[PDB]
A paper describes a structure:
In the present study, we focused on citrullinated α-enolase, one of the candidate antigens toward which a large number of RA patients develop autoantibodies. In order to assess the structural bases that underlie stronger T cell responses toward HLA-DRB1*04:01 in complex with the PTM peptide Cit26 compared to the native α-enolase epitope 26 in RA patients, we determined the crystal structures of HLA-DRB1*04:01 in complex peptides 26 and Cit26 at 2.6 and 2.0 Å resolution, respectively. Both peptides take prototypic conformations, extending throughout the length of the binding cleft of HLA-DRB1*04:01, using residues p31F, p34A, p36P, and p39A to anchor in pockets P1, P4, P6, and P9, respectively.
The most striking responses were established for peptide 26, where only the citrullinated version Cit26 elicited statistically significant T cell responses. Notably, T cell responses in HLA-DRB1*04:01-positive patient samples were significantly increased toward the citrullinated peptide Cit26 compared to its native counterpart. In contrast, a small but significant increase in affinity to HLA-DRB1*04:01 was measured for Cit26 compared to 26. The side chain of the citrulline residue at position p2 in Cit26 projects toward the solvent, fully available for interactions with TCRs. Our structural analysis also indicates that this singular posttranslational modification creates a neo-antigen that may thus select for a repertoire of T cells with high specificity to the citrulline residue in Cit26.
Residue numbers in the entry:
A (entry chain A): 2 to 181
B (entry chain E): 27 to 40
C (entry chain B): 1 to 193
């Protein structure tokens, strides 16, 4: 078919005033620009040794996108985005064995707009220690996906949920996992 | 050995 | 909670590579919410409105000849250039699979079970996973997840085999992947565990 695709994806979202700039290779992220720190963030640390990117150019691209959004909003008679709520799935990074370090992966897929609230819960309480996440990754249907990660030591005592809020959902969606 | 990704730039709308 | 209507602009600048870099297509794509409204395709050579919303931009942008020449050079200046920069850690990346086999539920012999072959941590996505009973490939009763992206430059897949295990049987899962020169294989024996 085609061997490889590289995509530079940008967005700007009103009224949130939130933008993103990222490069994608065959559906994995190479890097993004943090709009806060104004800094290039490599998906894997290794990538930074082989390559660079001037984060300032991303910032300038996003200003054009903002300006275009103002125009297109007007041109559509102020027609807003239709929420498409996410599908959520939870799985482990490797087969689960007791006391063997592992990672729970919350995969949040097929949604828009690109704003979610995601919390890991352990036994019904929020967990932050060691957790990570990606930015919003583009899809070919122009929706988004996103991953969250929770390092954990498997046990018989504990249960976990990935809690997902999104404007297209009536109530927060919980996806459950426990040791088999 | 160490290279520099180039950005494509969006155009401004009519 | 926040129910204020939202408005989203997306831009995707795409490079598509065929046969190394021997054929490249460049797509400059503009979206309003989820709907593409204008694009530049290197196979066309100019902007085209995808919806009527984009008509004014296509007309405006195609009237700027130095904009067009620059988009027409994007296959080289952008696509081929960025392929070069990332090639060593993307196109050239290979990570070995880890293979584990286990029954899905613990139960007696002569009762229906699922044997799971879990393949983890590999890159790139292309893999093939085969089940054998003793030395015959089992292709009926194979329930697979398909290829799962983990979001961190690895994949996994779980390929399950429906079995009614009997006392003296050996089952083997066989994995082939471009990071391997010979199949990686893992055995499971029909014992009381």
């Amino acid at each position: 078919k085609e061997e490889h695709v590289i995509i530079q994806a940008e967005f700007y979202l009103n009224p949130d005033q939130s933008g993103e700039f990222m490069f994608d290779f065959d559906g994995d992220e190479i890097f993004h620009v943090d709009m806060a720190k104004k800094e290039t963030v490599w998906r894997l640390e290794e990538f930074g040794r082989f390559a660079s990117f001037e984060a300032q150019g991303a910032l300038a691209n996003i200003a054009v996108d903002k300006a275009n959004l103002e125009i297109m909003t007007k041109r559509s008679n102020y027609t807003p985005i239709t929420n498409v709520p996410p599908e959520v799935t939870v799985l482990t990074n490797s087969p689960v064995e007791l006391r063997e370090p592992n990672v729970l992966i919350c995969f949040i897929d097929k949604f828009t707009p690109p704003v979610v609230n995601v919390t890991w819960l352990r036994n019904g309480k929020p967990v932050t220690t060691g957790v990570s996440e990606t930015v919003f990754l583009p899809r070919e249907d122009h929706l988004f996906r996103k991953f969250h990660y929770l390092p954990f030591l498997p046990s018989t005592e504990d249960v976990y949920d990935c809690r997902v809020e999104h404007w297209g959902l009536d109530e927060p969606l919980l996806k459950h996992w426990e040791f088999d | 050995s160490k290279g520099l990704f180039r950005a494509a730039v969006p155009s401004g709308a009519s | 909670g926040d129910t204020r209507p939202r408005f989203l602009e997306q831009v995707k600048h795409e490079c598509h590579f065929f046969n190394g870099t021997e054929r490249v297509r460049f797509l400059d794509r503009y979206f309003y919410h989820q709907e593409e409204y204008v694009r530049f395709d290197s196979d066309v050579g100019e902007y085209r409105a995808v919806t009527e919303l984009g008509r004014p931009d296509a007309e405006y942008w195609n009237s700027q000849k130095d904009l067009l020449e620059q988009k027409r050079a994007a296959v080289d200046t952008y696509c081929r250039h960025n392929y070069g920069v990332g090639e060593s850690f993307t196109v050239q990346r290979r990570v070995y699979p880890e293979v584990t086999v286990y029954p899905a539920k613990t139960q007696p012999l002569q009762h229906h079970n699922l044997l799971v072959c879990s393949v983890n941590g590999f890159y790139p996505g292309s893999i093939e996973v085969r089940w054998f009973r003793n030395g015959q490939e089992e292709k009926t009763g194979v329930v697979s997840t398909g290829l799962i992206q983990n979001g961190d430059w690895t994949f996994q897949t779980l390929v399950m085999l429906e079995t009614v295990p009997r006392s003296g049987e050996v089952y083997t899962c066989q994995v082939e992947h471009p990071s391997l020169t010979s199949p990686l294989t893992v055995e499971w024996r029909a014992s009381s565990a």
